[PDB]
Amino acid sequence: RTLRSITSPLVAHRLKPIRQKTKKAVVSILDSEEVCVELVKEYASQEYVKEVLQISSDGNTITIYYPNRGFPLADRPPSPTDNISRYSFDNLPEKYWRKYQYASRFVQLVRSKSPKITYFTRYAKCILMENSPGADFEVWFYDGVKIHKTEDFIQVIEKTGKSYTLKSESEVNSLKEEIKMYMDHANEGHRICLALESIISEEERKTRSAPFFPIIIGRKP
Amino acid sequence: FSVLNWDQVSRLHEVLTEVVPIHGRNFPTLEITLKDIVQTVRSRLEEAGIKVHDVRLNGSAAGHVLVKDNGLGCKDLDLIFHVALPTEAEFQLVRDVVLCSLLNFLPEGVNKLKISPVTLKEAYVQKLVKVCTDTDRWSLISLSNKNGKNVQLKFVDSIRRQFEFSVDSFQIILDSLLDFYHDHPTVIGESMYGDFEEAFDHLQNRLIATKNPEEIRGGGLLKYSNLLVRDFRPTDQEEIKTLERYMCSRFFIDFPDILEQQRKLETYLQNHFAERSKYDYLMILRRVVNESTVCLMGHERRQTLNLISLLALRVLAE
């Protein structure tokens, strides 16, 4: 079938550059917001880069190049040589989809641990994450509590240390009278942050200038 | 919509018969003729079921055929076959067409038919490019560059802009002399800049102009200054400083890192310059990027000027 029906193109915008070394690959979010997967072979006790995929921040441009044994593994991805190949997203042949998938899952992870709207309430510190749509939402109460809202998994870490996971609103409304108002608080905070996201994103679309995200709203008392 | 005369058609035979040596890396050197390559490639592409519409000469070769000594350097001999390329097997097979045509060049050649094509690649293919995006769609195979220059074979299905400046937008459609074999037929030439007359005037008078600045790759500044070094000059001062500021803008855009700038400068100097001229070229760069700089772009250009000055100090130190 098609690649687009497997994983959507990666969204590297606004992301602070990181580098992770897994067993098989080395994934980097280059400072220019281009994702960069580089494959590794251990050979003569050294590590050599065998091929490099390099992916535009819109996930639609794939530059794949191979060295002439290959490259020694540098801290920063090896600059492209002569033998290169540019494909578009839905022209990328099946040979590469898994390698592009490493990068896509990496960026979908980084978008889940990267703040877009930080908002300080009287009772908690809210963080709407970057991975829209269906953004993660952390709520770090000054009280020591933590409420992590995902797409269907809501973990609640109490003061003691107990941590459960809420699924459906059947388990949400069933909570004791204490944590129920914690949930109400975090829900109102998430509504706030989501409305602000929509408003400021539309204003950004109008002005079309330097980015309007991330945003930080308030101070810890 | 212009036709060549005996004037340039003489140099056409002179170029398409020039004996080219391609040196190996173990492997022996190959001694080939351009017309032999074009014909043996067209033959094997037609036996694979792929339409060879146009066959064209491009690059510095077509620039030096149209005018004797315009002072550009017979460095690039480019061959363009407009070729349909929908599937990936098309590219994967054009590679094989090129290499199978490449085998037939030794007496003990088929005596070594136990040489894999990937093994054949090691000595006889230098640069190897493959683009297949939403707009562009083509493949390039270059040949070794030792004693002679680099012989490029570029099979195109759809490329958007394929000229640097006015002076190098000239293509010689080879279907005429290719059907052939005052003993000459109608050999059409064409400019990628549009109205051919104005661009050919630009070439023969050594000028610089392009009404398509939106679409230049970041490294167009480098050939702008390659032209300034070999003594070309603009046409309208109305747009020259604006144009330099556009070119510098897209340079900083397509090469943001210090080390990518440095890589491209080093790999440009070593590719285009044979026989200290590097210093004059670097000074033309310094002047262009120093004058043509918006005051806002402060340290963006400061790192680049320090870098070019360091390149120049290195050059004069060796």
UniProtKB/Swiss-Prot annotation, chain A:
Superkingdom of the source species: Eukaryota
Location in or out of the cell: Cytoplasm, Cytoskeleton, Microtubule organizing center, Centrosome, Centriole; Nucleus, Nucleolus; Cleavage furrow; Cytoplasm, Cytoskeleton, Microtubule organizing center, Centrosome
UniProt PTM comment: Acetylation by KAT2A and KAT2B impairs kinase activity by shifting the kinase to an inactive conformation. Ubiquitinated; leading to its degradation by the proteasome. Deubiquitinated by USP54; leading to PLK4 stabilization.
Residue ranges constituting the Cryptic POLO box 1 (CPB1) domain according to the UniProt record: 2-113
Upregulating conditions: Down-regulated in HCT 116 colorectal cancer cells, leading to aberrant centrioles composed of disorganized cylindrical microtubules and displaced appendages. Down-regulated by p53/TP53.
Residues with Phosphoserine modification: S79
Domain Cryptic POLO box 2 (CPB2): 114-221
Domain comment quoted from the record: Cryptic POLO box 1 (CPB1) and Cryptic POLO box 2 (CPB2) domains can simultaneously bind to both TENT5C and CEP192.
Role noted for this protein: Serine/threonine-protein kinase that plays a central role in centriole duplication. Able to trigger procentriole formation on the surface of the parental centriole cylinder, leading to the recruitment of centriole biogenesis proteins such as SASS6, CPAP, CCP110, CEP135 and gamma-tubulin. When overexpressed, it is able to induce centrosome amplification through the simultaneous generation of multiple procentrioles adjoining each parental centriole during S phase. Phosphorylates 'Ser-151' of FBXW5 during the G1/S transition, leading to inhibit FBXW5 ability to ubiquitinate SASS6.
Family: Belongs to the protein kinase superfamily. Ser/Thr protein kinase family. CDC5/Polo subfamily.
Disease implication from the record: Microcephaly and chorioretinopathy, autosomal recessive, 2: A severe disorder characterized by microcephaly, delayed psychomotor development, growth retardation with dwarfism, and ocular abnormalities.
Subunit structure of this chain's protein: Homodimer. Interacts with CEP152 (via N-terminus). Interacts with CEP78; this interaction may be important for proper PLK4 localization to the centriole and PLK4-induced overduplication of centrioles. Interacts with CEP131. Interacts simultaneously with TENT5C and CEP192. Interacts with TENT5C; this interaction leads to the TENT5C recruitment in the centrosome. Interacts with CEP85; this interaction may be important in cell migration and centriole assembly.
Protein name: Serine/threonine-protein kinase PLK4
Record organism: Homo sapiens (Human)
Taxon lineage: Eukaryota, Metazoa, Chordata, Craniata, Vertebrata
Shown part of the complete sequence: 585 to 807 of 970
Swiss-Prot record, chain B:
Keywords: Cytoplasm, Cytoskeleton, Host-virus interaction, Nucleotidyltransferase, Nucleus, RNA-binding, Transferase
The enzyme's E.C. designation: 2.7.7.19
Disulfide bridge positions per record: none
Reactions it catalyzes: RNA(n) + ATP = RNA(n)-3'-adenine ribonucleotide + diphosphate
Entry annotated with the keyword Cytoplasm: yes
Family, as annotated: Belongs to the TENT family.
Function per UniProt: Catalyzes the transfer of one adenosine molecule from an ATP to an mRNA poly(A) tail bearing a 3'-OH terminal group and enhances mRNA stability and gene expression. Can also elongate RNA oligos ending with uridine molecule, provided that the sequence is adenosine-rich. Mainly targets mRNAs encoding endoplasmic reticulum-targeted protein. (Microbial infection) Seems to enhance replication of some viruses, including yellow fever virus, in response to type I interferon.
Name listed for the protein in its UniProt record: Terminal nucleotidyltransferase 5C
Species: Homo sapiens (Human)
Name of the encoding gene: TENT5C
